[PDB]
Amino acid sequence: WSSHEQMLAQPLKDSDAEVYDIIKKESNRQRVGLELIASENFASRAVLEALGSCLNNKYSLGYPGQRYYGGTEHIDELETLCQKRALQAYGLDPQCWGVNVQPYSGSPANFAVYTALVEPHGRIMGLDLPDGGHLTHGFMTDKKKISATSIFFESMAYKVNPDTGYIDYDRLEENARLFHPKLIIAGTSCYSRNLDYGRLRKIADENGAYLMADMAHISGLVVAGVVPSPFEHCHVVTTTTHKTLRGCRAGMIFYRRGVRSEILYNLESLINSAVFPGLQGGPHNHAIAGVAVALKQAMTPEFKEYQRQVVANCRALSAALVELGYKIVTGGSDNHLILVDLRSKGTDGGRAEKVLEACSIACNKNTCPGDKSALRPSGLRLGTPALTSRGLLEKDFQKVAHFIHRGIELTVQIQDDTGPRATLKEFKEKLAGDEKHQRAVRALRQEVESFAALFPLPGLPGF
Amino acid sequence: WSSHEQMLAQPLKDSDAEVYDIIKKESNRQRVGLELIASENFASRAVLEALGSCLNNKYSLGYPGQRYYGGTEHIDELETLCQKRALQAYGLDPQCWGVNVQPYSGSPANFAVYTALVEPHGRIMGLDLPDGGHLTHGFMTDKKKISATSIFFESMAYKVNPDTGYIDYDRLEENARLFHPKLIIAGTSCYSRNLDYGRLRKIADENGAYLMADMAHISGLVVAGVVPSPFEHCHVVTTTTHKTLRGCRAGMIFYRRGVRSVDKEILYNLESLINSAVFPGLQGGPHNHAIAGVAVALKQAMTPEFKEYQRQVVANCRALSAALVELGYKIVTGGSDNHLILVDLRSKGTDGGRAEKVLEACSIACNKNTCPGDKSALRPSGLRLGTPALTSRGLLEKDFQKVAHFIHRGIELTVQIQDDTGPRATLKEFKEKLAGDEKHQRAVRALRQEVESFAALFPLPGLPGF
Amino acid sequence: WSSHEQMLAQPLKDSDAEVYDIIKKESNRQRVGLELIASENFASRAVLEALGSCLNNKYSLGYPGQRYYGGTEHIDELETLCQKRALQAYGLDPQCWGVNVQPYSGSPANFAVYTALVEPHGRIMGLDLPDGGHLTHGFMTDKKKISATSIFFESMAYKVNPDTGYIDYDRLEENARLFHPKLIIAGTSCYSRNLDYGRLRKIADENGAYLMADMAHISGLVVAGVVPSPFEHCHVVTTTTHKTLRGCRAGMIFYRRGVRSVDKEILYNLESLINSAVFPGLQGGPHNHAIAGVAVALKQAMTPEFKEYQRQVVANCRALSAALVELGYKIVTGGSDNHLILVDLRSKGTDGGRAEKVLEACSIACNKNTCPGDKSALRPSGLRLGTPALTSRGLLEKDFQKVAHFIHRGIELTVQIQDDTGPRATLKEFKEKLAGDEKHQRAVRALRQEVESFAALFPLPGLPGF
Amino acid sequence: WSSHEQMLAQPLKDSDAEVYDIIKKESNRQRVGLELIASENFASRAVLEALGSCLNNKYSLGYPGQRYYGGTEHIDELETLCQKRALQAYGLDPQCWGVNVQPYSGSPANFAVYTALVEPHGRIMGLDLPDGGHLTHGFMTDKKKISATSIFFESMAYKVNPDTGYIDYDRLEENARLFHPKLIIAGTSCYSRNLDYGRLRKIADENGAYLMADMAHISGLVVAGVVPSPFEHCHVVTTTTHKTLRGCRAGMIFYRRGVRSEILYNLESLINSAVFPGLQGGPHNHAIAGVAVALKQAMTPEFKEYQRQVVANCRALSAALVELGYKIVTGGSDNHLILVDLRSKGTDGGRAEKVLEACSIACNKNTCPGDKSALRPSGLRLGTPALTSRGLLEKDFQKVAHFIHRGIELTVQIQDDTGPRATLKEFKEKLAGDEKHQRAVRALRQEVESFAALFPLPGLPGF
Ligand SMILES: *Cc1c(COP(=O)(O)O)cnc(C)c1O
Ligand SMILES: *Cc1c(COP(=O)(O)O)cnc(C)c1O
Ligand SMILES: *[C@H](*)c1c(COP(=O)(O)O)cnc(C)c1O
Ligand SMILES: *[C@H](*)c1c(COP(=O)(O)O)cnc(C)c1O
Helix, strand or coil: CCCHHHHCCCCHHHHCHHHHHHHHHHHHHHHCCEECCCCCCCCCHHHHHHHCCHHHCCCCCEECCEECCCCCHHHHHHHHHHHHHHHHHCCCCCCCEEEECCCCCHHHHHHHHHHHHCCCCCEEEEECHHHCCCHHHCCECCCCECCHHHHHCEEEEECECCCCCCECHHHHHHHHHHHCCCEEEECCCCCCCCCCHHHHHHHHHHCCCEEEEECCCCHHHHHHCCCCCHHHCCCEEEEECCHHHCCCCCEEEEEECCECCCCECCHHHHHHHHHHHHHCCCCCHHHHHHHHHHHHHHCCHHHHHHHHHHHHHHHHHHHHHHHCCCEEHHHCCCCCEEEEEHHHHCCCHHHHHHHHHHCCEECEEECCCCCCCCCCCCEEEEECHHHHHCCCCHHHHHHHHHHHHHHHHHHHHHHHCCCCCCCHHHHHHHHHCCHHHHHHHHHHHHHHHHHHCCCCCCCCCCC | CHHHHHHHCCCHHHHCHHHHHHHHHHHHHHHCCEECCCCCCCCCHHHHHHHCCHHHHCCCCECCCCECCCCCHHHHHHHHHHHHHHHHHCCCCCCCEEEECCCCCHHHHHHHHHHHHCCCCCEEEEECHHHCCCHHHCCECCCCECCHHHHHCEEEEECECCCCCCECHHHHHHHHHHHCCCEEEECCCCCCCCCCHHHHHHHHHHCCCEEEEECCCCHHHHHHCCCCCHHHCCCEEEEECCHHHCCCCCEEEEEECCEEECCCCEECCHHHHHHHHHHHHHCCCCCHHHHHHHHHHHHHHCCHHHHHHHHHHHHHHHHHHHHHHHCCCEEHHHCCCCCEEEEEHHHHCCCHHHHHHHHHHCCEECEEECCCCCCCCCCCCEEEEECHHHHHCCCCHHHHHHHHHHHHHHHHHHHHHHHHHCCCCCHHHHHHHHHCCHHHHHHHHHHHHHHHHHHCCCCCCCCCCC | CHHHHHHHCCCHHHHCHHHHHHHHHHHHHHHCCEECCCCCCCCCHHHHHHHCCHHHHCCCCECCCCECCCCCHHHHHHHHHHHHHHHHHCCCCCCCEEEECCCCCHHHHHHHHHHHHCCCCCEEEEECHHHCCCHHHCCECCCCECCHHHHHCEEEEECECCCCCCECHHHHHHHHHHHCCCEEEECCCCCCCCCCHHHHHHHHHHCCCEEEEECCCCHHHHHHCCCCCHHHCCCEEEEECCHHHCCCCCEEEEEECCEEECCCCEECCHHHHHHHHHHHHHCCCCCHHHHHHHHHHHHHHCCHHHHHHHHHHHHHHHHHHHHHHHCCCEEHHHCCCCCEEEEEHHHHCCCHHHHHHHHHHCCEECEEECCCCCCCCCCCCEEEEECHHHHHCCCCHHHHHHHHHHHHHHHHHHHHHHHHHCCCCCHHHHHHHHHCCHHHHHHHHHHHHHHHHHHCCCCCCCCCCC | CCCHHHHCCCCHHHHCHHHHHHHHHHHHHHHCCEECCCCCCCCCHHHHHHHCCHHHCCCCCEECCEECCCCCHHHHHHHHHHHHHHHHHCCCCCCCEEEECCCCCHHHHHHHHHHHHCCCCCEEEEECHHHCCCHHHCCECCCCECCHHHHHCEEEEECECCCCCCECHHHHHHHHHHHCCCEEEECCCCCCCCCCHHHHHHHHHHCCCEEEEECCCCHHHHHHCCCCCHHHCCCEEEEECCHHHCCCCCEEEEEECCECCCCECCHHHHHHHHHHHHHCCCCCHHHHHHHHHHHHHHCCHHHHHHHHHHHHHHHHHHHHHHHCCCEEHHHCCCCCEEEEEHHHHCCCHHHHHHHHHHCCEECEEECCCCCCCCCCCCEEEEECHHHHHCCCCHHHHHHHHHHHHHHHHHHHHHHHCCCCCCCHHHHHHHHHCCHHHHHHHHHHHHHHHHHHCCCCCCCCCCC
16 A cells, blocks of 8 residues: 555654653653662663664574574674673673573573573572562562462572671571572672672582572673672673663573583573573564663773762762761662661651652662561662763762652651551552642652753653 | 763764664665565564653553552553553453553563463463474473473473364364363464364363463454454463564463353453563563554554555465465465465475575575474475565565565575485585585576565665664 | 280280171171172282281381391391292393382382382373273373372373273374373273283383383283283383282382393383382381282292182183173173173163162172263263182182172162162162162162072181181 | 182191291391380280281272272271271360371371372471481482472471580571471481470461471370370371381371361361372271271270380480490480480491391481581480380390490490591401401390390290
8 A cells, every 4th residue: 555655654753642742751751850769770872773773673583503594694793793792891701601692681581590500390599579689589478479480490588687787698508508409599689788709609519509690780880890790700690781781671691601610511502492492482683782782882981980970979879868867778888779777767668759759759668677567668779870870970969868858858747747657548648638748749849850950861862 | 981971862873883784784684685484574663763762761560550669650651551552453342351561572471371370380282383383382392391381381282184284173172181281272373274263262161271362473464354353262362563463572461351151150360360470470670662662553553554454465475375376386275364374395396494595595585394294393394484574565466476486486496406415415415505506506696686676676664774 | 014015915806806806797798798899809818927927027128238227137038039039920030120029009109100200290191090090090180180190290191992992092192292201001990901012112112201011900810821911011010919919918010120222222220210219219118017928929829720710710700791791781892801891781771880889788899980981970881890809719600600690680670779769860869769768678688698698608718717 | 729729728837938937037036136226116916916817808999988899887897996096095086186097107198198288399397317307208418309208399407406406496487487388397216305396386387387297206105195295286197006106017197177267177188188099099908907906005004004114214224324424415315215426435326236236236327416427427226115015124224225335345346456547348347357356246146135035025926
């Protein structure tokens, strides 16, 4: 047809006004808000351009040199290039390390590794969820298995010491001798400290287990050399490509090659087989191009500088909050985030996140090591990656600290009008249903959005 | 250091010349070639524009109803809109059907359903791979379990009758009574005929099993009303959004809501089990930019232009099959009801394994596939051919007849090379003969030229030559 | 307190009058009844004497080779002797066959083999229960797994052809290619014909599976050479020691040793895997008194008298079947090659469910069983009849013809009662009609008298009326 | 035939001379030896008579009131009677407790319970093997699963404190919150102390798990009221019928009936279904008769007296050994056995058991809580049930203590001639290959066998 020939060439603005409008409103919402959620960032224009390329059309099952279909000359150049930049970015010798770049995301990357090295019902140990662990590391209760990791495998968590906020390696070492894990996971979603990879490797070798690092949250810090690298002691390293690496959504699996002890590593073929034809079908080539572009950007001195600023910003933010009387779990941080214990102010993350949200300050609740209840998490997780990508510096994060402080005070107030004992649903009602309050929110929001508009919003020119 | 901000705003062309160059060469490769691989298509510009939006930066966990974090006012509008268009596009009453739009792709969508309704080691039955089934429907040998479906669940396949090329429903009905499946899969990767959903539903109900349709390959034909809908008898329907639906890569899970049976009645519990399996079960944050792309593709799929596109797709397949029959080729089941056909090359004394390589060198893309008969997977007898991609470029019946002759020229050439390599020669040797033999290499070059010239006559959908 | 020692030396008759009385009544019940249940027999006095020996007090763990504790000089002589007699009795070369004699019973013997060669969730194929298979070969429905074999492993049955009553090897061969079993079971609980071990071995080798024979029902016939031996084609053979072997309750596992295949050759690893599964895998200390009983039964089974007993067993079954055919009864497969027959009572308008109850009240023991046809398990059409027990009491062909008429009288009576209860009457009601109805109760009493008088004419093997 | 008619009536002595001879030699070996293996005993004549009855011929699938075959009038009387005596013997109200008497032995009884309440891959926790646990409670290494319990289910052990020799309940309570067991096992094969059932029940209820007691070793002590009963806090109790109960080999499963909390107990049908048709076929009726006879004997005042003597004998034996300078794990015992730590004499159980065996003194090696190696167990497990059934009293066990002591000295000697460092195979050679030694053995053996012949050997008149 003559009209069908152009339906395929019509711009989004004309083709789908409704979706186009939603993107515009979301673009604007991101501009006037303060993003403190530790897992978010702003991808560069170049990365986003690669996502909408014609690579979306190429279907290519398999791997370079092992393709099911033909016509993959350029797709091979792409994937090969992506793998080369991944090893390079982390300073890895291709004779000792290899990498798979097809995982659709972080969760799928972890699952493929378990499938490959652990097998159904094999034992896996990971940091407990309320102590800062991730769902894919295992999540189950006494009556039900929630995470797919816990459903298809046998997981058992290890905890942090509630008095220090640090991972209790001694207890882990002891429990591992009884549990007999086939794989131990070193990775976190809400832990402000570096992990003792060396100690974990010793514990893993003691039980004949593999040591897998999930560096999703610190992958960017690692490339820049701002926090120790897990590649020195781990057998496998998984990671997402967004978060601190600042790329598009996707995942990667790094695995050791060569001699293990003369015993040789068999990780490569097991992992590759698990990703495909095991768990996935055709790879998302447009996403692989986006990652390639993100990895090149991550190797620039500018990126290195960005990462140093990220950590500096976190330090300034934590210091400013301590000065305002806030308690930081473990007293501080070594990376991009901090867990703030709000008990030091008589409130909780559950109520605080809602008030701050209404004020255009995004962050999320999280349980603190102590916490005797998950229905009333004591802390707030705060991260600096996103705002640092917008150019905020130390002086800016001190102002951010005051805005957050204003928020906490407000959440406390809506709490003093409700009485020391009241449900979360009563609190939210008194929040949006009170002259002085919905009015307190409106005022703080205005100051927050004005301050936020002073900074550039990375991405495509203008949606 | 100051150039860090100038780094996040820099265009791809300046930021990464190497990747930019690869995209250009791939864009050009797609333009001068003839795409006959049944699972490929060309996504519209609008869809691709949605993929590179700022939706990439939004991390949301959970569903529109209950999210983990805040600031999802617009993400909720998006996902909700996407779900509404999905039900609408397939003519489904939201009181009887619901839909999850977060699966990252087709394989993940199927796996989430198994995880939800079957549970570890539960029994699943699907069409055998060499008979046209998909990996995610189960794949194992007597010594090893390859597909994740076969590793975490207990799968057993059902076959097609090798004499008719059709699915043997009688044998399936019998074997199901002994196997006791908890779920039966109705879906194919290389089957040219409609599926008897009604018959499969009866067999499923007989064993108390769920009937799941994987309509990935025909999802576009279904929307246009060109082939019967699986929503009439199935409990669950999974699908990819690319392939015939012509969207970006992603997956969707449709499930029934309301009353299942009586006596006094019992309700469907598919919704919460499936939603829980997708998240927090198997996935983390949804890819919102991909959900926007799907939304855009679903709106385009409801237009009369799309419906006309789908009619042309089937008409093209019919013309292509007729033209090949006229040239003496054997088509499994003798023909097709949809977008593809499986060509049995034994009728010409060669096989798909060698033919696909020669055709590839001539810029004609397609893939080998075993035929129902075939007593060996190392020497598949057929070639799977699809019309979706080329129809999106505007080819009509007369164009597919010309395509048929180009393919025929290719087969003749591969036969010439096969006779030159020997009898017990290996594919490895066949490919080397095709690579370093000026004689054949000259035949290839000539045919390639004609194929690429003919292909340049048609527009390549997408962005402005990117 | 001083009478404690006088307590450990006191005879059962004085020590426990109540138990002693029960044994007396049971001994008498066995004497005046006609035992036609195919799985029963009467163990010799010698065997029973070994069971009550001081071997009961010896706790030994491990095997003759390597034990956990000491003081096993004689226990080693015993187990070693038992293994030697087992191989000998079946004419097996110890260089090609080995045997484990610790299983506590038949079910445990099978389970240990599955545990050793299959592993959790491994695939196993066995004869379907309603077609004559045993529980330990797999038993599950579409909603629940009943047998431990079906709970810990993945089982799928194969069936007999309902028109011929024979095992459909063709369908099994086909289904095995799709199911991929790791082990196939050749053994039955209610099948009157010989098994085609050769054919099953070919099918097993085709799928790389092990072939395991469960010869529990025919172990005695095999020793005597009255039916073909499964040791010619199987990799493993399990069996109970009671039933036709006429020993005490226990089980044994025979496994091949040496070279399995070539190319350069590979060895059998069955021995250590099986031994490890029995102990320390599934069992603790072996029952030595039971191992002594088996040893004694194996020596008796190698005598010419035993061989003659086994020939009489088969001849009796043939006469019993012929006599029933003459009375108009239908026998599945038309006859038998061994010790039993499945009688299809549809040929008389009744079913095994009601017939077994009436016959029981007349002191004629047998059990119901579904026939290949049967469209319902709640109304089994047949009766399984065996001759081992009565042949051990000396009945000959002319005696089994009289037995046939008594059974016939029973069937006529159950038909009379069925017509009196109604059409859609329940078994519950059928049993109540048979219980509180002087008319039928008078018919029962009369037939019972004739049956018990005829049965008292024969000796009851075992101890002196105990 | 006329000769076949009598092959079945011929006595064992004439029918099978070879087997008959073996029984005679074994009967004699039992008479002249000193049985100190804690799991052995001598069954009464009455019990043995029931085993060789005509009950061996009756095939009866199912349970009373639920039979597959007919002609079970007396078999029903038997099983019913056996169940009634089992409940009675332990003072259980049939409205609150039920019992299955078909398990062929102890291991099968445990396995059926796991099959019924845990299901494939369900989690189970039991006392670690080297700390006194039993195989059926779980046994696996970092590379292989040995016990069927560990192969079909997911097991993890709990340990004893190596400094006190007692079960560390605190650590168990902590690990259970991470492991999430569906069932916890309270039972031992080599533990001289009573178990804190109350504490274990609290831990089980805390994780929603079932508490199962395996009282195999103390079932006789329990009936007599010499050690606390596990029926006060457990949901299920399994046991063998030999060992201290002094019956034939068989097993039983006791389970609670009635209201659990209005939630009702579902143990009965699950357990019955698992035993049959789940795991077993026809029950061994002759063994059920033997158990019935053993249960009646266990309820007599004479049996009660026997059990008091058993414990008194153990106390005297332990005191006499302490006086000779031997170390007893946990310092003593509350029951029929003791674990002797031979490190206090510079030798190990591995070597000592062999020397004592050569001297006609039966016992077995066992690791001590400390032990940094299973290939060189430090202790010897000694039990008094068997010898007490032969009439030994306190004064007799003091003499037994000296004989054992003489044995230890000899094992040490063969050890001083071999040098502080030598393999177990060299030691055994120097034992049987030395004039003074094989001569030392012969002498002690003579004294041991003479002393042993002074006591009656329970059982059948004379084989
Ligand atoms: C966020 C996060 C994930 C989830 O990533 P997805 O790409 O959303 O699937 C996985 N692992 C860790 C350690 C994380 O922080
Ligand atoms: C000895 C013992 C067993 C083993 O009994 P078997 O009857 O040999 O199978 C099981 N459990 C415990 C606690 C034991 O002491
Ligand atoms: C292609 C295809 C798939 C796989 O989809 P992916 O999106 O590539 O992961 C699944 N099912 C069917 C029926 C297909 O044709
Ligand atoms: C009877 C029978 C069994 C069961 O034996 P048990 O000793 O009763 O436990 C197993 N297999 C077959 C083939 C049988 O006939």
